[PDB]
């Protein structure tokens, strides 16, 4: 209950990179004033989406403060420090402490096979170095590759310290059961073409990566639901899968930071690779898509 | 368009065994009258519910001619005639089509692979012996290890004579781009459990097992949903996933059958080996559960 | 131990169809009598490969007469019982006794789920059915769907009655560990691709669709590990492998059938539908694969 | 042919820590001559077994330049400098070579998805950065995520630059495949517990995490072979994999390192977290295997 501040819809922040593959500072900073004046609820920093994965912890922790200076007392902010590492996910949780962060989360920990206990011990161990912010469980067994069990997630989010779960499933008898064991639990849908479906199956929330170009549309769907609006949360989820059939034709990440950049919001689309660059007959779509989208507005 | 007469909610027949395993006729046509009073807008006929796999052809003609002598003119009658052999599935057709059924289905073909073509060819070759009645394409991937792409969908959604699909998948990305790719499709969501969240995604309807003890539920979220009512939709869904609970704990079939024991409905709950019986230690809670239904209508 | 007789190299019988589908008697006679001339050990009828889930009940007992009628007593006869029905399994089970088979088998049954311990009783009530024949236990997970874990197996070939495994799997751990586990099972490979592997990893003789076109390949890679002739296991494996993936490209079954046509033993090659024909453009490859084979002996 | 002098059985170094989880810098050296008296072949640093992804990659660069100066000129060195990065992976394969390894390797980059044109132009950016010293492509689809077909796998291997692949697949087609289409290729067998079977399927060595407790029984299983001992080498596996079976029950990193501090190798036999220490209960079992390993010798 006392952390129902945590809930809403929050972007996953891209990181964005320099034409030499670095960290671009000065269009992070743009794009969380950009995500901000869209009137998200949060931004979720550092995730899978932030390619974190591809960057080292100092260059994580260099985004973590970046965007804390720009964002700590206007919105939440909850920074991912997971890794498979628990000492290296230590210390981002307690750099997030230190720049002011709301909330840290981390992955479930990939590619060696970790039993449940290992889980929950990892998780005990962050929300330590954590000194007292809430931990949100990231979910995302497609990327993972770990297969919890309801009961097990059931145990995750009652571990002392735990206040969310970031529930990246398309399996919404999964997500009501969640909701109907847990009424008080912040619920963040992490797949965005299901949103409403989402939202409707018990999320409260949502984390998301195409929330950077077009919250305004998802922050619609939990208005038109809360509304009883059925036509209008359906007609927008439309026009969200629309643009993620295109954005998973182009590539995601690198789709996204492109219409960013037709936005005048990043300065340079790249990921890092080893994410190839967007291939050119696809620049004429994503530039229609920009422009739509900030007529849109 | 020409086949809406198919959009609704029709339970998934389940087939009334005796004490020695054979049809239970006398309980078949009571379970056809009790569904038919349950409002329904028609029944699906042979299904993998109404235990086809473990029936002979003569059985599955048997069933398929009493329903369609108490059924036909009153509800929609839908006739599972799938088999993996074609020309069993063929011959089961014709009779759907003799007996006076108004439409027929088939499962992807399954056990064996076969190709994309192969499976289109047996769909076909079904549609031509049903002579003039529509086809349901039914897709449960988790059952049949047949796994179509989202183009595979679209081609045998507008093959000649097909009319519906049965979308047992939990994909509502998938069943959203169904809808966006075919507005006029009858859609029928196949996880009673997301019932409520797939026809936000697109589903105008659905066949489930589950609707033989509670179809007023899943008729109350329809309504709830066209008239706006969120949060009624999300209860009513709740209540179905609490009952669902227990029937994936009791084992589906033989718990829906020994709740509709305890309804009056049926004589005899068995289903046919290899399911064993009800173990006595859920007896109470499906009886508690048959009350609760009968005092909630 | 009192069940060594069921040790060896055994083809999956193909089932001869005629040009409309119908069972070819006359080429099934003469395809068992093809086999009983390569020196096989036993045959395998009413399997996977022999078409049993696009074949009625009394079909298969059909065709597990005729086979007993041309080679009990001459080879060793196994026949597959299996269906997903229980009672229907133990039809063919009782029917296989009358002709004299030597053995019964039946796949795991499939489509629905069904617990271990239903797993378990359906091959008890088969296993009585039989009256005395010892039982094989069918393992294919990849088409079955079912995932036995190894204690799973080792409670299976451990109930009274069950003299022989049949293992379809690629897992040469698994295959060690039951070899250790049970130093006297009859343990017959089921990938014909792996075979020499699969030996070397435990298994005492195989159960293949393609020894029915070369089993003299086989029998010889048997007798190079026994003699400690490595290199011609190897070589043999990869001449089998050579017409494995070829029969993969045109599809096995129909592919096998097609060879056989070309050696003259069946009179139609044909699969049931939803088995396409062979397309036009493997012939030649098939046709030049009869003759090569015929040559090699 | 120009890389045969990589063919061989090489153990997958562990990482040895401290007790407060830094790399034990005189165990490690220990654990290096310890390989090199077993009469490995070569030595495989910085892989899965070596704990590669929970260090950074100062800490990686600081193992390959130890190992190194072990290990250079006395056995084949290889350097596993795969992550997710290409930039990092680029890093350590300069590293390498700087180093004076013979080989560099690298895992097919995980968690996000990527085409197979981006993996391969991972392995070229990071063949560049090796510098004229040949690739290991690492396929290990269990943990990695990534499913290669055989067609990629062949254009992988033929890469310029490439000299070897590490197949940790236990699908032994896949691995007869390989070998018929490369007669020349330096193909590693990676599960250790299909060794034997492995290599007649057509793997020439092999990279293993048990190489580390007992080489001498996978030497053995090479020499069997050749020397057409079939039994010989199913007794040795048959060894093997009773070990295996208890590394697997413990942990298998941790349990290697406990059995190598009760030879005497490693002083401290922790892994890094989430990875928890060995239970209590196991260690009778594992210093009992040390014991028995020491006479065996
Ligand atoms: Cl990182
Ligand atoms: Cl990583
Ligand atoms: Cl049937
Ligand atoms: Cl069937
Ligand atoms: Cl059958
Ligand atoms: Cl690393
Ligand atoms: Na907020
Ligand atoms: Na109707
Ligand atoms: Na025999
Ligand atoms: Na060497």
């Given at each position: 209950h006392?952390?129902?501040?945590?809930?809403?819809?929050?972007?996953?922040?891209?990181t964005p990179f320099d034409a030499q593959q670095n960290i671009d500072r000065a269009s992070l900073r743009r794009l969380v004033?950009?995500?901000?004046?869209?009137?998200?609820?949060?931004?979720?920093?550092?995730?899978?989406?932030?390619?974190?994965?591809?960057?080292?912890?100092?260059?994580?922790?260099?985004?973590?403060?970046?965007?804390?200076?720009?964002?700590?007392?206007?919105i939440t902010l909850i920074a991912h420090v997971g890794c498979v590492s628990t000492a290296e996910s230590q210390q981002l949780?307690?750099?997030?402490?230190?720049?002011?962060?709301?909330?840290?989360?981390?992955?479930?920990?990939?590619?060696?096979?970790?039993?449940f206990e290992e889980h929950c011990d990892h998780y005990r161990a962050i929300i330590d170095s954590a000194d007292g912010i809430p931990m949100v469980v990231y979910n995302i067994p497609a990327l993972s590759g770990v297969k919890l069990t309801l009961e097990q997630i059931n145990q995750l989010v009652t571990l002392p310290g735990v206040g969310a779960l970031k529930?990246?499933?398309?399996?919404?008898?999964?997500?009501?059961?969640?909701?109907?064991?847990?009424?008080?639990?912040?619920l963040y849908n992490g797949y965005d073409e299901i949103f409403a479906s989402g939202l409707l199956a018990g999320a409260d929330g949502g984390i998301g990566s195409?929330?950077?170009?077009?919250?305004?549309?998802?922050?619609?769907?939990?208005?038109?639901?809360?509304?009883?609006?059925?036509?209008?949360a359906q007609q927008l989820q439309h026009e969200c899968n629309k643009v993620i059939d295109l954005?998973?034709?182009?590539?995601?990440?690198?789709?996204?930071?492109?219409?960013?950049?037709?936005?005048?919001?990043?300065?340079?689309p790249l990921c890092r690779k080893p994410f190839a660059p967007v291939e050119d007959k696809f620049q004429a779509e994503l530039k229609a898509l920009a422009q739509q989208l900030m007529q849109e507005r």
């Open positions: 006392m952390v129902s501040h945590l809930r809403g819809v929050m972007p996953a922040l891209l004033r950009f995500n901000i004046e869209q009137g998200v609820d949060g931004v979720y920093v550092g995730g899978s989406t932030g390619e974190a994965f591809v960057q080292s912890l100092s260059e994580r922790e260099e985004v973590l403060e970046i965007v804390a200076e720009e964002a700590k007392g206007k949780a307690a750099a997030a402490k230190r720049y002011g962060f709301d909330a840290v989360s981390a992955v479930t920990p990939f590619y060696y096979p970790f039993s529930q990246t499933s398309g399996d919404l008898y999964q997500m009501e059961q969640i909701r109907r064991a847990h009424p008080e639990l912040v195409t929330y950077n170009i077009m919250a305004w549309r998802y922050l619609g769907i939990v208005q038109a639901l809360k509304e009883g609006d059925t036509a209008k954005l998973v034709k182009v590539g995601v990440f690198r789709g996204l930071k492109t219409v960013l950049h037709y936005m005048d919001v990043l300065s340079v």
